[PDB]
């Protein structure tokens, strides 16, 4: 179906403890494929998926230099932000950047992104037009003015519409075994006595990819308010897990149905407790 590529970047200052730590990772869909950590000894961007390993040394050299350059410009930008926000040099601060693209089933650009946050809050974002900016505050407006003067958006647009989509297409082909495979959830319901009067029914979804996915109904009515739904969580082997639970009075289990939607499933699943 549709796909995405994202590059995530975080720099965290540590006054009195050297220069900021810089960590960047790249994803295609919900698959990590590259990483760089500035605190590694002679840091390089490293592969994290089999299908990127085939890129040649010139790829890794360029990626590594881009990462080092970004670490360095983030250092300067963190200093700038102290000025813009009238902050002291004493505290640790955080600068985040995400950029990338979404493509449709046929591979055309659906949306591009390039956005920043400072101390966990929106700072500046390239709008969906890939031509104008949204600044969160009067500090980010200073950046906006500079980036309007320098015609930054047009340069970003050219990358997002061109290389970002082209390289994502390449990765999807090279990674077609995995990136183009949905693994459906393995599903079951478990029963957990609380007392002789009631028990928890827990509906499990295990081993699924991608992460997007669970509801309980009682007599066909969504039990939104009474369902404990955990955040989708990584298994550590590419796949994800999730569960949803409801407390059920003794003898009432057959009123309850668990409903599962996942792109890996041809039709939504309906499940019940099976003693």
């Amino acid at each position: 179906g549709s796909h995405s590529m994202r590059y995530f970047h975080t720099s965290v200052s540590r006054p009195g403890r050297g220069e900021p730590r810089f960590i960047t990772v790249g994803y295609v869909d919900d698959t990590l494929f590259v990483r760089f950590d500035s605190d590694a000894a002679s840091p390089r961007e490293e592969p994290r998926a089999p299908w990127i390993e085939q890129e040649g040394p010139e790829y890794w050299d360029r990626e590594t230099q881009i990462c080092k350059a970004k670490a360095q410009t983030d250092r300067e930008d963190l200093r700038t932000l102290l000025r813009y926000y009238n902050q002291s040099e004493a505290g640790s601060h955080t600068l985040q950047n995400m950029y990338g693209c979404d493509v449709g089933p046929d591979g055309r650009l659906l949306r591009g992104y390039h956005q920043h946050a400072y101390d966990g809050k929106d700072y500046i974002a390239l709008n969906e037009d890939l031509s104008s900016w949204t600044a969160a505050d009067t500090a980010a407006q200073i950046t906006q003015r500079k980036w309007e003067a320098a015609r930054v958006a047009e340069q970003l647009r050219a990358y997002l519409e061109g290389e970002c989509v082209e390289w994502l297409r390449r990765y999807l082909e090279n990674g077609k075994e995995t990136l183009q495979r949905a693994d459906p959830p393995k599903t079951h319901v478990t029963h957990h006595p609380i007392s002789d009067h009631e028990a928890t029914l827990r509906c499990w979804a295990l081993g699924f990819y991608p992460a997007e996915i669970l509801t309980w109904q009682r007599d066909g009515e969504d039990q939104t308010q009474d369902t404990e739904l955990v955040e989708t969580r990584p298994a550590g082997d590419r796949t994800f897990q999730k569960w949803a639970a409801v407390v059920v009075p003794s003898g009432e289990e057959q009123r309850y149905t668990c409903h599962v939607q996942h792109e890996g499933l041809p039709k939504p699943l309906t499940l019940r407790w099976e003693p």
């Binding site: 360029r62 410009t73 700072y123 990358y159």
Partner: peptide, 9 residues
Amino acid sequence: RRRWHRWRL
């Protein structure tokens, strides 16, 4: 693949 970014905040 990544892009370069020459423009400071």
